[model samples]
Each structure stands twice: as C-alpha cells, then as structure tokens.
Target: SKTAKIDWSHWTVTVPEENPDKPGKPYSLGYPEILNYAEDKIASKYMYDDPKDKSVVFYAFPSGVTTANTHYSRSELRETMETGSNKVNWTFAKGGKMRGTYAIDDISKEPDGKYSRVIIAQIHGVLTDEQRDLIGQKDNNAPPILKVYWDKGKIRVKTKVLKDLNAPYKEMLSEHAWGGDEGRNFKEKIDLNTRFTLEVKVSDGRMEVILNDTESLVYDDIHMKKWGIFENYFKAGNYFQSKTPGTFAKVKIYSLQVTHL
Candidate 1:
C-alpha cells in the first residue's frame, strides 16, 4: 500500500531533548504538546470518534539498552464516530519489515462524560509483515511497529500480515497505568531488566511503547490471575543508569524520529 507523509509546514511539533537525567521516580512529560495527543478526555466518555486518521510515534528514553535489552511500548489509539465494528491494528517488526499483527476492533461510542479510558498496547514477540512495513528502519536494532487510523471520531486499526510465516499470535496485551500492574497480563510474559529504555507514543487516549532489546525483569499473566484495566498508563519506575551514586553518565539517546501519518 502507498503511504503518505504529512507536510510539517502544516503541523506543529515540539522536539524533545535527546537524553535527560532519569528521575528516581516517574516525572512529568515537560511539554504540553507531548500530552496533547496522549491524554484521555476529562469529561468525555470516548477519546476520539474516528479510526481512519493518522498515528504519531514518540520516543521517551533516558538511556539505551546496553548491558541488556530492556525497552517499553505503552499504547496507541485514535477516536471515531461510533464503536460499531471499528478496528484498531498493530504489528511487531525489527528493521524495516512487516510482521504479523495483534488486534483490531471498533472504537467505543459510549458517552464517557467523565474520563476517557487510557489505551496502552505492548508490541511483543517476533515480527510480522504488517509490522515491518510501517515500523521498520534501515539499520540498528529491532523497531516496534504501530499503525493508527482515525477520522471524525471513527477508526479502524488493522495489523496486516503476508500469511506465509507462522500462525497468528499476540504481541503484548495493553494496560493503562504507568507503574504497578500497568499492561499486566496473566497469559503473557511481562518482563523488564536493568540497562533498558522506555519510549512512549502518544495519541488521543491511545499510547504505544517500544522496549529496547534486553533482559532484566519478568512478568507472566497466568490464566485470569491478574484482573481488569490498568490504573495509570504513565508512571516512572527507576533511574536510567545508576551505577552507584550522584555521579552519572549523560543518558544517551540513539535517535528519536516522529512522523504524522
């Protein structure tokens, strides 16, 4: 499929700092623009009403995954008119290839006159064709894929595949909160380690995270052992690189690329 890129002359974006010090705990995003596309509606039941618009990718890293492969992919979503048969899609790919996808469903139309729910989807396990097509780059490590669609409060996010590789499987299940139990799944492997980075892609109530390649902690959602909805989708955990004191190396950021599609 032919994809079009948005002309920057028409849109406004505030570029983030390359690498900043990692706070001991979760901290504010700093820029209002960062939160513009990522926060839930305060008094609206739904986040967006469209599902065929565009998706934005954000990279929030205080450091790179050196000693181990540690990374984060939180959520990504768009709103639409109704929730009838709307589909949200995604894929997982490293480099620039399409991988299989995770899920696609209609956007909810429920009149949430209060707080819109936060959407945090984890891109886990292998790569797919659909995933590679959009999230792939020329070089470096594996890049997570996230494709969003939204228009006038309606959306259809679909992750496509070539159907020749392996049978369809799931990436990481989505969760809301930033810390504890966020993206927790009893049937999935939710693990993290030291020397990793966590990136966040923000879009109206929808979010995405790209966990770098590493090994540190582990989380498995067995059966229904864990239950419903994550509480906060944006919480901080620990310092980026704390070897043993106030002295620290500047958090290194390989690169941060953002596009409006």
Candidate 2:
C-alpha cells in the first residue's frame, strides 16, 4: 500500500518572545525570518533539535532561541486544509478524531524551578483563522480540544470543552501531580527511545483515548454543535516552555496520523 505524504510548506512558524530590551511587553521574529530558521537549518524538517543542547539532533525547534531568556515556538502544520488561511468547511459536524505515533527522547527541568520540560500534541477547536494566528501570542486564550502532555516524569491527558476557550488554560485533570492515581508514571512505564501510539476518537458528544494497546481515558459531552462558526484541526510537535535562561527540552516524533470519522 502507498503511504500518504505531508505537505511541509503548509506549516508556519512563530516564536513569541519577551521584549528583552523592554520589560513585561512582547517581542519575536518575523514570520519570514522564522520560516527562514527552518530553511536555514535552525529548525527541522523531519525531526526536532534542542536549540540549547549540543547532543540532541533537531530537525526543527518549534520555538528556537529568541533571547538568552526567551524561547517560545510552534510550527502550525495543517491536516484538514491546504493552508491555515484556507477556510475549513467541516466542523466535526459528524464528529472527528486524530491519532499520532511518537517517542519521548528526553526531558529536563528548569534550573530556576519556574517551569518543567514538556512536549504537547493536541487538536484545536479553532474558531477562526485569526485565532489560529493568536496561538503563542500574549493574552491569547484559544485552547485545544485535547492536549496530550508529556511532562518530565509523567504522561497526562487534558480535555477542553467549548467553554475553555474563554478561560485561563490550566491542567483539567483531577490527578495532576505525578503518582497517586491520575495516569501512568512516565519514568516508570515509559522509557526513553520507546515507541507508542496515542489514539483519540470523538463522536456522539464524547472523546476517548487509547495509549498503545491499553484504554487510557475518556470524556463525555465534549462534542460541539457550534462548530459551524469555527474550525478544528490537529498539531503534532514540540511546544516547549522554558523559564530559566539556557534551559530546554528535547523530544522526537516518529510519526503522526489523523482520521475523521
């Protein structure tokens, strides 16, 4: 059987930065410059590199180094439309789903204790093209329908309803801390360089997830009927949040798959 190919150009890069020269404001590189990072080998084509680490092989760093203290990056890859600017007519009217296969390479904690190393893969119930552009922007509130978090020592699944778009984004799981009975411990069950498949299915007002071969999590009444005014899509890559200067996280995505049912 022939495999499908991904259109790499359809994706856009954005690295929001703190106005290093000015305190408490915003700063970043131009879209063309950010894309140039990808073309210039600062970003990746098929793999990710830790911009701050010398050992990790990076095809791209979603958020490349912006300053000694700022690095926020995301590569917006489109799966349902030709481009993010192109309007998507489908709104999960009959429900939608996405699945991705990936591997966790390594995670490191920040030295200042401000943030931890994490990689997230998610599906967004994007309401507009402008909203899509607002991702990583300061004060932006748009959230993903499902957020799969690969935190330092654990794997967490977070689901968002339509209402979450207006609320401050926070972990929604009851068992958020490592251990206790929230989910599998990343260090104990998931090992470095091991491959795993994460499957997410949405239908009949519910969302379900399967990790590898085991059933992991579920949420009911999450289906949206107001999607006619919005759009939905998938994103699979690194969106690292580093607080202390010179800190970074590294991960490699082996494969990703999206299916609408």
Q: Which one is best on lDDT?
A: 2
Candidate 1 structure quality by residue, lDDT tens digits, 69-152: 233211222221122211222221111111111212222222433211212222222223443344442322221222222212
Per-residue lDDT for 179-221 in model 2, tens only? 2223433233555556677777766556677778586576664
lDDT of 2: 0.47
What are the models' TM-scores?
Answer: 0.20, 0.59
Q: What value does the lDDT take at residue 121 in candidate 1?
A: 27
Write down the worst ten-residue block by lDDT for model 2.
172-181
Per-candidate clashes come to 80, 7
C-alpha lDDT (0 to 100) for residue 192 of candidate 1? 17
